Amino acid sequence: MKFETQLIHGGISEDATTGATSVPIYMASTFRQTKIGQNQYEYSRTGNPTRAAVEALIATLEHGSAGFAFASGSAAINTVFSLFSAGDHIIVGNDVYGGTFRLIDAVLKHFGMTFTAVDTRDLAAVEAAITPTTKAIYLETPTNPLLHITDIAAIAKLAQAHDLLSIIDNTFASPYVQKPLDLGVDIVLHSASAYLGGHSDVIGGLVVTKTPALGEKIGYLQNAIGSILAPQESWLLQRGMKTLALRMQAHLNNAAKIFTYLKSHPAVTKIYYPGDPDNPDFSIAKQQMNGFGAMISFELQPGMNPQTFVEHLQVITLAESLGALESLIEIPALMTHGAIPRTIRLQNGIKDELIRLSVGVEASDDLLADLERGFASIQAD
Amino acid sequence: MKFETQLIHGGISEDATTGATSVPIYMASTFRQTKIGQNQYEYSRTGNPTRAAVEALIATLEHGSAGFAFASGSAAINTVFSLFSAGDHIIVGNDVYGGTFRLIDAVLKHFGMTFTAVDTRDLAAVEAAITPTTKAIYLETPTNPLLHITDIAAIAKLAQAHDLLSIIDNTFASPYVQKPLDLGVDIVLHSASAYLGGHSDVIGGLVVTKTPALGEKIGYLQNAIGSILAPQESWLLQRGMKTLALRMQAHLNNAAKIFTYLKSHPAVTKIYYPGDPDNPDFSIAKQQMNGFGAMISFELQPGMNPQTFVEHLQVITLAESLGALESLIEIPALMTHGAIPRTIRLQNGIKDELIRLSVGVEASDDLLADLERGFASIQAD
Amino acid sequence: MKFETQLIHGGISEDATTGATSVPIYMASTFRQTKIGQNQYEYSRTGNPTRAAVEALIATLEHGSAGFAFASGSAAINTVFSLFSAGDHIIVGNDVYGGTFRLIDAVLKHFGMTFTAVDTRDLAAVEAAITPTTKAIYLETPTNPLLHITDIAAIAKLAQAHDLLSIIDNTFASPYVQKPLDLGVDIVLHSASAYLGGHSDVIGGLVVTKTPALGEKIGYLQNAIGSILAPQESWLLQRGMKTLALRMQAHLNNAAKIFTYLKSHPAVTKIYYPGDPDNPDFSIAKQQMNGFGAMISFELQPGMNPQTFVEHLQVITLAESLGALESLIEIPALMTHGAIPRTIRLQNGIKDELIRLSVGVEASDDLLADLERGFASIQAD
Amino acid sequence: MKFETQLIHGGISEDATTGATSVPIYMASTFRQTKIGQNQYEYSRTGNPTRAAVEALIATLEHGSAGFAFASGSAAINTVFSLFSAGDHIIVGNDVYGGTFRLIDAVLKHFGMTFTAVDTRDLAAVEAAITPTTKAIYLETPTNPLLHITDIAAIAKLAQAHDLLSIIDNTFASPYVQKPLDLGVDIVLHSASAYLGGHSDVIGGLVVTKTPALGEKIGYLQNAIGSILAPQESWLLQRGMKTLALRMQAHLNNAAKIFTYLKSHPAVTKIYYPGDPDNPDFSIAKQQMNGFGAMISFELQPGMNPQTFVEHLQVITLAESLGALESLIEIPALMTHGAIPRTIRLQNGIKDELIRLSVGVEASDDLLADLERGFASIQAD
Ligand SMILES: Cc1ncc(COP(=O)(O)O)c(/C=N/[C@@H](CO)C(=O)O)c1O
Ligand SMILES: Cc1ncc(COP(=O)(O)O)c(/C=N/[C@@H](CO)C(=O)O)c1O
Ligand SMILES: Cc1ncc(COP(=O)(O)O)c(/C=N/[C@@H](CO)C(=O)O)c1O
Ligand SMILES: Cc1ncc(COP(=O)(O)O)c(/C=N/[C@@H](CO)C(=O)O)c1O
């Protein structure tokens, strides 16, 4: 079936017993067994029909064999790194979500894991960073918040040639835009809190593995650590995923128009956007991404107050998060990336004045009218 | 106010703005800020009114400074142990939940943490286990499934004398029965999937710390690892907790009667129960526990089949989990503790014939009649 | 099985397919049919597993044939009265909930139904009100808010002798106190928003009938009018219902003490309470009720301001509704019964000075202490 | 703001106090009052923040003054008809949903209301039916299931000239397609179970009045009869509504392709579709509808078994209901319209073999392949 049909009917989308057109929400913590060990479900944390349903869906969408739903994107990441042990070495991208930087520095390094940050746009630099004790490569593409694009297929071949896990954080793209397991990657994960839920009303994470052997290891850690996605939220997450494609098209059309409009403003000095033809990422972006994503970051002229700008928007919402129906806007350095020290932020290209815009699905004319309220307030229209 | 009043009115139990006699379920993933950094709430994972309310309530019930709600009891444990680093040594009780055994051996030991199992009923053995790298003592009391009682106040003073964190799993008792923070312990935690929820319909974990400094450390890990309790399920947990005292009184009266009845039966060779006066635990049980719990384990004569016994009950339910309104029953070696290898199980007192019974709140007469069906099926009435 | 056991296991309390210890929440609106006319469920309004479970349970608890769940007690009453046609005449008790009065006067009378209000304590006056076009007798017992007791068995015999439907609103008592169908009544109904839900967090109605024929007519109207209880709230209602006996014991015990205490206060001139032995209803109360309920109304000395009294309570909550874990208090003339005109209020016994107290399950000591802050604020303790 | 922007941000879409980007779910049945009569909310049936939010939203979308949410479409209709009295006469269309027919015949006629069914496409017949006791005109447009289009503006002018209420069931269109209040109508109502919820997972109804005087009457009846939409489902409805415009566009695009495809199949003898240019309703549809709807009904050649056809579809689901993300199909005479007697069905144009297809948003190639499987099974490809 085609992708839009899989959103509506893929995974488990029905209750086989009743024919119900929605997967029932199994709040039950436990399950009566008639003879020990022959039940399909035993304990809600270990598995239950509602969570299994959204888990089957994301596996279908990402073209993986197994999916796993977690209480948050961060918990999904924490579980995946629980594959590694003291003395393992990991290669990480140098533009990541501030919370992933926090997990690495404040938790995983205490467990004896060691990390080297690399610009994964430079595959020479990636291969140079590989050591005999290296075990995996972890990167987001496009990145949070600079939207750097990494050649996934190239990273995956590099990874295969050295017996490394390749791990792609696919949050920003979504399986509608990018299916990294189709490019050789071992593990893909999402913060479902963004596009996959899409309604600004659910926190969760998703992991999909290509092979069943790696699925058995993730599933074992999922049950062992217990950072599971609750049944109500699993159900809400699936419901929102059903409109993923319809939402994404609106998202992407609106972003294309926002980019063009942002470039028509002299108040804007720099724009980060995978669809910029001047951007040297642009060719690998058009090859591996179905569209250019709905994130855009930009700087204003050095005299211009970003706080003043974002605080004078009226449709666009000043908030953390992204991928919601409503446009969200943020200053990474004061908000989602405050967890990264300022000196490190600035070495890796996150200026204190950078603005991150998650383009919603509102009417584009209303969005542009709103953005000009922001330019007007810094004398820049 | 008194405990029962606190269940209904404590923590946050009301919406201040409207007067709503229930805390609203905040499904929102994010919050509009009017200025950056002035919001009370910024991102659902970091905090939201709904999860905050149940966190406040368990903190009041346990007489602590701060509460923290997690996707499950296992996720609470995993977060607590992320306080520690590679090379840290931890003393654990030798009778723990099978999954806590699982997490320690399969995950925590890969992070460079080391562990020594000890009968925490023998305080000299505990002190003998303390090494220069030791960082904490972790134990359940009563234990799962043998219901061994440990002198909490003694363990705390031992831990304080050597700069250790004392961590008590209070799942089997609940704050109605046992308030470890009142006996000097540093951290108390729960699988909320038992008595606190009480209705067999929610998976969750709760952690309470005495001091605000330890609270800031748990809170930071909770946000950084992200195994939060979702909003809907936090609300459901708080709702169940409101009837904790009424449920607990009923649980406890049925368990008293179940204990008397199981001793009148010659088919039962051994009974594990804190209210047993033949138990050497009995004196400490009576001193630190308000009631003897509603868990009971027992063995049948070596001829008799426990699998047959449990499969012939019709009110008591054969399943995992405990602490629900419905009586639950289980064979640990085939179920909740099959994650511990057989050699270590029998070395530590868990025979394969052992039956664990979670005494519910049904009419006691309907419960004894049901147990008589199981005895009759192995010719032993 | 005994009542407490039925609460936990009666009606439908588990999912037969998986063994889930909770009935799953079927959010689906519709159900795939394989062959037309062969599905168990077709459309969620007509029926679904979640609502069916709570309907089955209340039917067990009330000793009836069929249960029906509505969006509120008002909607339940509206559907029951849709049994009747223009020209039909109904005898009603003269102390009914203000909203039942409003339905009758504002809606049902426009449908050509006619009504005589009668003190159903006086059976001779009930018989004198029976007319050639009379079809039914409808009353609450105990009444809202004067807690008048009517002889249920006698009213049924009277109704049977003239081919009338007898309808008892059982909200204040609950099946724990009073099972009207056991006394010959044709239809029993509840505002489940009170004791049955128990947690101040669900709006709902319930109807149970004795015979299947009357059940077919109520069910037909339920589906035709469509005032159904949604699945989420059906599941929440059933979960509340499981603790009904535990909660009721507590409610009843506190209300006993509250009554004793309110008689010791000279500021209280009059007390309405079915457990009052100076009450002429007391004997029939003791014969048809299992406990005297947990409502109490009372008046202060004419100088004393009831608004002052209730506004100075700190544990008792000033609000509408009743039957919650937490104590609620209210002034009917100003609140739940302001829908009745003041002249009709006074002729039927509801003074503007009247205070109605819904006794919760807080510790009785904290409740008596709270009540004396009320008395203190009008200089009367 | 534009329609697509109002979906995301109109009505009440935020929590004012916390800035939550989703309206909180107020499960509370009641609200503490500080001084009597000064609360914004007093009782959840009478109103609560969550239901108020979706009520504001639908009022904005339909360009009306006030919105009202009910437990189902049928309950919304039942409440609107409680505006009328015994002796009142109502004019109805002759093609209505089977349940509206049932409500009229089995309930409202018992209340002394009288009805005359009329082809509302024939304005002369409408005028001919107006009597001195007539008070309203009620019709769906498009109708269920023949999709008959009525000139709404003309019907409103007719009703204005005789001081009648015009009531339009707008379920099949959705406010994205059709806004009857902009054409002079007094009341618009929906079964929100269709396109508004959009996800096959909510039952509810909506009513919107143009004037505030009519709003006060509807609101008074809503509270008095109590057929409210519960808080959980109110919130789900609103979340579904947020994607209404994105879903509708996909709906309508698929329906145009399905219509073309069905017209090229000789097995199809008659098609009912508002966008058929040979349909005499085409011009009025083009003029008053923003698109032709996503419903299609059709008949096959007299030899061909419609049951065989629909039972061989694999993406299209045989089930009641409509307006869902997934395609639904149905045979009205055996299903949604079985409540109308067969003789009356055939008099008014519903043949026993009519098929009613609710076009979903699956990929159109997958839908066309699926329809082929149905035609193949009747030897008609
Ligand atoms: C690329 C990526 N991976 C993982 C996560 C973490 O996932 P949860 O938020 O725990 O669900 C995030 C979160 N980022 C949001 C929230 O701060 C934001 O930047 O605004 C992310 O952007
Ligand atoms: C003393 C203790 N601590 C932690 C946990 C782990 O808590 P979650 O299940 O993750 O909520 C449990 C679980 N025990 C149940 C579950 O199988 C059981 O044994 O039947 C426990 O008993
Ligand atoms: C004896 C009785 N029957 C029916 C109803 C109507 O029940 P819903 O509220 O529609 O569920 C009520 C409600 N009374 C509450 C609420 O005002 C109260 O008096 O405080 C009632 O007390
Ligand atoms: C034009 C119209 N108005 C009102 C209703 C009644 O609305 P609820 O179902 O009570 O929400 C319906 C329902 N019809 C659906 C379900 O049978 C169907 O035909 O498949 C309707 O189609």
Domains and CATH numbers, chain A: 3-241 (3.40.640.10), 244-376 (3.90.1150.10)
SS3 D280: coil
Q: Which residues of B, range 24-83, sit inside 8 Å of A by Cβ?
A: 27-37, 42-45, 71-75, 78, 82
Collapsing DSSP states into helix, strand and coil, what is residue D367? helix
DSSP symbol at B10: S
Provide DSSP, A220-240. Answer: HHHHHH--BPPHHHHHHHHHH
Give the Cα separation of D345 and D362 in Å (integer): 32
Tell me whether strands D295-300 and D355-358 are parallel, antiparallel or unpaired. antiparallel
Which pair of structure tokens corresponds to residue D264?
């090229």
Residue type, B52: A
Minimum CA distance residue for ligand 4 atom 2: D97
Distances (CA, A) of B39 to A306, B48, B258, C92, D20: 18, 11, 53, 55, 11
Distances (CA, A) of B230 to B44, B51, B253, D61, D233: 9, 7, 33, 32, 19
Q: What are phi and psi of D140, to 5 degrees?
A: -90, 145
Backbone angles phi, psi at B89, to 5 degrees: -115, 135
Reference B313, options B361, B250, B375; nearest CA is B375
Task: Residue A206: name the closest of A43, A380, A375, A53 by CA.
Answer: A53
Closest listed ligand to the CA of D102: 4
Dist. CA B221–CA D238, nearest whole Å: 35
Residue C335 touches partner B, C-beta closer than 8 Å: no
Instruction: Say how many Å lie between the CA of residue C146 and the centre of ligand 3.
Output: 14
CB contact under 8 A, C84 and D318: no
- Cite the DSSP H helix spans in C226-330: 231-241, 244-263, 282-288, 306-311
Tell me, rounded to whole angstroms, the distance of Cα C254 from its chain centroid. Answer: 20
Q: Which residues on chain B are in Cβ contact (under 8 Å) with A228?
A: 71-72, 75, 203
D120 is written with which tokens? 């509302």
Q: Ligand nearest C79 Cα, by number?
A: 3
- The H helix count followed by the E strand count for chain C is 13, 12
**Residue whose C-alpha is closest to residue A362's, from A319, A320, A314, A330:** A314
Q: What Cα–Cα distance (Å) separates residue A14 from each residue in A10, A18, C31? A: 9, 9, 9
Nearest residue on chain D to C101, alpha-carbon basis = D224
Give A135's contacts (C-beta < 8 A, 6+ positions apart).
A84, A88, A89, A90, A164, A165
Calpha distance D300→D286 (Å, rounded)? 27
**Burial code of C176-205, b = ≥16 C-beta within 10 A, e = fewer?**
bbbbbbbbbbbbbbbbbbbbbbbbbbbbbb
The best mutation among D171, D229, D236, D335 to test binding of ligand 4, ranked by most ligand atoms within 8 Å of the C-beta, falls on: D171
Find residue D139's DSSP bridge partners. Answer: D168
The CA D43 to ligand 3 mean position distance, Å, reads: 10
Backbone conformation region of residue C196, classed left if phi is above 0, alpha if psi is from -120 to 50, else beta:
alpha
D317 touches chain C (CB under 8 A): yes
Cβ(D9)–Cβ(D1) below 8 Å: yes
For residues D306 and C35, is the Cβ–Cβ distance under 8 A? no
Q: How many residues does chain D have?
A: 381
Grouping H, G, I as helix, E, B as strand and the rest as coil, residue C168 is: strand
Among C290, C259, C293, C299, which Cα is nearest to C276's?
A: C259
Q: Tokens in use for A228?
A: 């599971």
* Alpha-carbon gap, residue D14 to A32, rounded angstroms: 42
Q: Do B182 and B175 meet the contact criterion of CB atoms below 8 Å apart? A: no
Measured between alpha carbons, how far is B113 from B111 in angstroms, rounded to an integer?
Answer: 6
The 10 Å CB-count burial string (b at 16+, else e) for A349-360 is ebbebbbbbbbb
- Quote the CA–CA distance of C30 and D193 in Å, as a whole number: 10
Kindly give, in sequence order, each residue whose CB lies less than 8 Å from that of residue D105, ignoring residues fewer than 6 positions away. none
**Is there a contact between B188 and B177 (Cβ–Cβ < 8 Å)?**
no
Residue type, D48: N
Q: Note whether D339 and D317 are within 8 A (CB).
A: no
D229 touching chain C per CB within 8 A = yes
Of B177, B193, B121, B117, nearest in space to B152 by CA: B121
The rounded distance, in Å, linking the Cα atoms of D351 and B120 is: 79
Cβ within 8 Å of residue A258, ≥6 positions away: A296, A357, A359, A364, A367, A368, A371
Q: Which helix (H) or strand (E) holds B93?
A: strand B89-93
Asked if A201 has any chain D CB less than 8 Å from its own CB, the reply is yes
Asked if the bond preceding C142 is cis, omega within 30° of 0, the reply is yes
- Elucidation technique: X-ray
- The tokens describing C225, both together, are 């009018």
Chain centroid to CA B8: how far? 21
From the number of C-beta atoms within 10 Å of its C-beta (0-12, 13-18, 19+), residue C341 rates as: exposed
What is the layout of strands, in order, in the sheet containing A317-318?
A268-272, A295-300, A355-358, A328-330, A317-318
Give me the long-range contacts of D272-280 (CB less than 8 A, separation at least 24): D272/D145, D272/D146, D272/D147, D272/D296, D272/D297, D272/D298, D273/D147, D273/D297, D274/D142, D274/D147, D274/D149
Instruction: Report helix, strand or coil for B165.
Output: strand
Q: Which of C30, C82, C203 sits opposite D45 (nearest CB)?
A: C203
Buried residues in D71-83 as b, exposed as e (16+ CB within 10 A): bbbbbbbbbbbbb
What is the maximal distance between C-alpha atoms in chain B?
A: 74
Measured distance CA(D108)–CA(D114) in Å, rounded: 8
Q: Which atom of ligand 1 is nearest to the CA of A337?
A: 19
Q: Which residue has the tokens 């026993």?
A: D352
**Cα dihedral across residues B149, B151, B156, B159: positive or negative:** negative
Residue D286 CB: number of other CB atoms within 10 A? Answer: 15
A261 reaches C (C-beta below 8 A): no
d(CA D61, CA D176): 8
Taking Cα atoms as reference points, which of B143, B235, B142 lies closest to residue B197?
A: B235
CA–chain centroid gap for D38, Å, is 37
Tell me if B107 sits within 8 A of B78, measured CB to CB: yes
Which residue in this structure is represented by tokens 């134990």?
B139
Identify which of C99, C107, C230 has the shortest CB distance to residue D230: C230
Measuring CA to CA, how many Å separate C31 from each of B230, C263, D233? 29, 58, 19
Ligand 4 surroundings by CB, under 6 angstroms: C 43, 45, 226; D 72-74, 97, 99, 140, 144, 169, 171-172, 191, 193, 203, 205, 320-322, 336
Look at residues B46, B51, D4 and name the one whose alpha carbon lies nearest to residue A321. B46
Three-state SS for C173? coil
Q: Residues A320-340, buried b or exposed e (16+ Cβ, 10 A)? A: bbbbbbbbbbbbbbebbbbbb
CB atoms under 10 Å from CB of A88, counted, come to 19
- Work out the widest C-alpha separation in chain A, in whole angstroms: 74
**D2 near C CB under 8 A:** no
